[PDB]
Symmetry: D2
Subunit: 387 residues, 4 copies
């Protein structure tokens, strides 16, 4: 019941089920997984593919011969299981050299190094069949006001992304970029902190068509924002290239709980939106099995991610197909929201006495919106109190 | 000492000092102010100008006869004091007809009425010499997920702003629009909730050059965001058309405290940024004197807004003029942040062996950033524990 | 299906369904309800009783004859419907005289007035059969640091509550007090901001046995706290006298959505706790039907409060009775949490080599807690994915 | 200028300046410090003393032989510099055995081990002259609702603290316990999450006089609470045994910035309260120099903690000494707040017609509170815009 299949396009980062449980206050509680074991276990649970940072697969500072042997094992595991690699990314945050950032580090030589590290892994991503390259600028930011001139840093960030668009264009690579926003942690404030800031930044790049967003449930909620609303704005702009699914309990540290946990009604409205919009990209889980768990709990947590999506997908479809919800949407005038305000045009609007001179504002004000019934129907469907 | 003059460009909304103290849990504590009296008292305090909603100046429902008397009195008060009207805006949130929004109400007739109400006040704003027209969509949004399809709502919001841009260009008006974001309150979630979301939305308008942002200190802080960082991104995009200054203590209801209150160091870094970037627009206070105050406290609170700006301006200037701070900025490599990462081009960067193959990452990782020394110098300057 | 009955002990404040929709930015959207109509409508929906502020029932400044006629109508409506009045409270926040507080107003004469207003309504509460008297100190606090010496204010707050305990003891009234915490709004910070602060304060009253807490879902969540955890601490201390149920979407203004909305999984764990602890007080909804709604939406919202509680009660009971959840609780050692750590006593613990000298910390560390399976079983039960 | 001396009682944890910079997303940026070197560097900066976790001083797993050498070296360093050890604490959060807690772990054998580990370090703390023993239950709590029955967990926490109180009283030790609250991180929710919750819990211990709180600036601010207000309630209850000073920017991960950073006006009001109440304990800094810094920045950040305290102390003293501020305090009736509301008794209050029957509420409502003038004087004093 609610069994995931590869057609559901569920993907996992190597670093998700691979997380050893080291947090700001504690040591690791689990040993490291071989990426090959991760690929095989995830295939048996019904996953579609896996994603990776360069440093998840290739030990930092590996020689080229040493790099080749690491890829070849991962290689074979993907071949054996039919697992795809739809997305890859760069670790520009763990090594101490990135303590003030990669692309916007104050030191110029670190910025050049970060670009070279990124470009090497783009090559590898394309070889493995990745269609999306994610950038999470986790160290781009500041703890204090004078440490970072944000106008200069945005110049440096634009320069880096423009150079990367140049590289893939010169190589003829069929790959797009997705910026993953986060408001804070591990920096006090991170540049491009929300979906909105990232969307605005993309419009100033030299070729904006190459760049989209990879929003994460928990990151927008870390700013108290409505995640389905932000996803709707990304869809409206044509910029939802990828998505990170997990759970988060409000405004605190980045929890990365399994999808479904955290804010359950936001999860319901998110799945309703993705499915009714026909989003066809990967459903990627950027989550961390809590460090209380042994490895059997790791795979239970990963399976739970996939199961909760499938349950919510079923309830959202039942909600939209219910004839009673039908009528309630018409009663709340959702179909009128979808109609133009003034397709007659500006001149006609200015000459329409019914729009102002003779508009009965008191009668219009008395009309109820009937939102609370509509919402209780949605609650009933989520909880299985109707079908 | 720290006395404002009209040259400082301090402006205030009629609705700020005119707030009667009604909050969700309590009735008014102050009598209503005559707009003419506000203009005169504000001029006596050293203000540069005043701003208004249509309904602050002209009582809602006023006959075309009564509307003319109200503007005449106000124009006369402006002339007698000198005082300017740099910006105006529409009240699309108080009357019950707007309970589901103005531009994005589900009911089409409400949406047409909201546009007609706005266009009438654009005409009045231009006659009074306003250069900026502000839109705060306080009722655009939702409490529940099914009540608003956000993709349709963004279509309607774009339709509204495109029509307004058509109107002003057809009349030859030399006015620009500024969107004022806010994440929530009075709606559970408000559309375009942060500076970034509004900046992104503007790029999809038909004539994006006509539109910028009017960010408010407290509104970005209601999402836990760094207001100076968000202002920097607006400046970087060429979109800071106007600014609302006030105070806010973190993530809670919108407090609208006087400027300087709330987060004091963020106010310092904001004034440093505005003054160093050469922002030339109004320094506008969107604040509410607390309802504990009588009219003497109203005027004391308004004077405090201006005074705190002027103190912070002095300390930020002293900070940037200090040779020891200039040293510390070079020690933290802020000057290198301003340097192109790779003006030598993509190919040169790829061939530069010093950027990767022979980059000593451990030596680079060992470099201290000297940020804490720089920040304590900024502390000392703010507190006047050095000159 | 999921039909409320008076035995479920659901209660509503007159001010909940009576809320006219006036918020900080908008006028009322609904006319006022006669308390008699409220009592009759709520009885037909299956409610158990109603609660009131003095000012909900008796217009402020009513004469004694005028007071008598208002009570007599309410009176008869309760008699006709069998509705109970289990709780009442005082409005010490709406009138401008309370702008700096009631019990902790700086002005001594206002503090005496607040006590006299409270004592009059205690008499009325007892006449109507109330067993709990709630105090929400909504104006007790400050916007600025110097306005309120909190040690002096806590002295004044203790003095007020001690005097009230004296009054009911002298009159022989069978009634208890419950303090309703809230962290902020309408004051910048409110004294006793959380359940914990209120519990601590009660221990310094002259007769602590007379005082408990009335926690509200949304208020604890306004501080980002775990509401079920706080309710557990109140139960542990023997202090849960009353509870306010509603919904809240994280850290923002006090939304007072209908119960079930906001944080749905917290609602599930709250009902699980209340039912398994055998809480026998009223299930009181302190909520506000959104101002988008007409009166038919008001009653739909109120019915939804009751329905969601009953659905969650069913899912929580099914969760606890599931033999698979059974085993999972034993697998996660919840029964071991309920056993003493050292019932053998201090001397035996100090002499137990297995507790330290010979404890195998590495073997103990390797044990998984199996929390993620347990939690996915709970998710499955909430969503009706198992029975 | 603003130079610390041992008389100022500034103390630092070994783990503060000794933090190597490991965060959830990054490896260490600094080498480990020898405790003897920290003691000497801190003494050179003007510190009064140092504090420690057992595992900061003695490497975990040390033989009883190796443990003695470590303490001897440290005692010698203390003697050479003078330096005191006013408080000590137990690390019950780093080792993986504590992944579900120490005192409230579901596994009983872990709970017994946590007690034995703590009791060993109490003996060491007393030998080094510590007067306060701090407990931060960083791992007590949960990520999911069913993992922890909080009522049983509070039974186990009380059992643990009662046993510790039995131990110290049986040995004749003259040490007191201080509970350090925190709302979340590293657990999703931590038990006893705020100052109020811990104060309430203490009153249910067997010997409550032995236990107080160790509040931390950033931890209360992680719940959006007013830290000076919470300190005032701890003082009012006689329970402020110790304090942790640092900086935090609002509701996010625990930043542990140096004191003065974060919320600057709250730091001012905190220092005003501590100094005016005559708090005599240590001024302890629980902070982390940012991982961007080298060892020069570590020491600069520590010096900044002390310097910012001393600047704020001067400005708060000037504020309270200013005759114009004393005037403003009387104008705001702070002196009347300090007056008993009804020292004449319940019966006299009931018979006082001036308190209700003849109280002119509209005249009282008209009184301005003059809070904004008072607060701007406090501003001026903090910024040194008056003397
Ligand atoms: Mg992510
Ligand atoms: Mg504003
Ligand atoms: Mg309530
Ligand atoms: Mg601490
Ligand atoms: Mn995350
Ligand atoms: Mn505002
Ligand atoms: Mn509430
Ligand atoms: Mn901390």
């Amino acid at each position: 019941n609610y069994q995931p299949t590869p057609e559901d396009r569920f993907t996992f980062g190597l670093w998700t089920v691979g997380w050893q449980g080291r947090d700001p206050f504690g040591d690791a509680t689990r040993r490291a997984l071989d990426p090959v074991e991760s690929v095989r276990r995830l295939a048996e649970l019904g996953a579609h593919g896996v994603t990776f940072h360069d440093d998840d697969l290739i030990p930092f500072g590996s020689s080229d011969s040493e790099r080749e042997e690491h890829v070849k094992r991962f290689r074979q595991a993907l071949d054996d299981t039919g697992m795809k690699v739809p997305m890859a990314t760069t670790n520009l945050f763990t090594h101490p050299v990135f303590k003030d950032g990669g692309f916007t580090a104050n030191d110029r030589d670190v910025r050049r190094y970060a670009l070279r590290k990124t470009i090497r892994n783009i090559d590898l991503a394309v070889e493995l069949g990745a269609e999306t390259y994610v950038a999470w600028g986790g160290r781009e930011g500041a703890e204090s006001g004078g440490a970072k001139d944000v106008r200069d840093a945005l110049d440096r960030m634009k320069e880096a992304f423009d150079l990367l668009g140049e590289y893939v264009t010169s190589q003829g690579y069929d790959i797009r970029f997705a910026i993953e926003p986060k408001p804070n942690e591990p920096r006090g404030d991170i540049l491009l902190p929300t979906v909105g800031h990232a969307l605005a930044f993309i419009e100033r790049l030299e070729r904006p068509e190459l760049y989209g967003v990879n929003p994460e449930v928990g990151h927008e909620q870390m700013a108290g924002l409505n995640f389905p609303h932000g996803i709707a704005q990304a869809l409206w702009a044509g910029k939802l290239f990828h998505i990170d699914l997990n759970g988060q309990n409000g405004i605190k540290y980045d929890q990365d709980l399994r999808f479904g946990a955290g804010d359950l009604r936001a999860a319901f409205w998110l799945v309703d939106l993705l499915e009714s919009a026909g989003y066809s990209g990967p459903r990627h889980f950027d989550f961390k099995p809590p460090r209380t768990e042994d490895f059997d709990g790791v795979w239970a947590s990963a399976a739970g991610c996939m199961r909760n999506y499938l349950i919510l997908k079923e309830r959202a479809a039942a909600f939209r197909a219910d004839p009673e919800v039908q009528e309630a949407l018409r009663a709340s005038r959702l179909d009128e929201l979808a109609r133009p305000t003034a397709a007659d045009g500006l001149q006609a609007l200015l000459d329409d006495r019914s729009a102002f001179e003779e508009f009965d504002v008191d009668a219009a004000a008395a009309r109820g919106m009937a939102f609370e019934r509509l919402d209780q129907l949605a609650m009933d469907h989520l909880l299985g109190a109707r079908g």
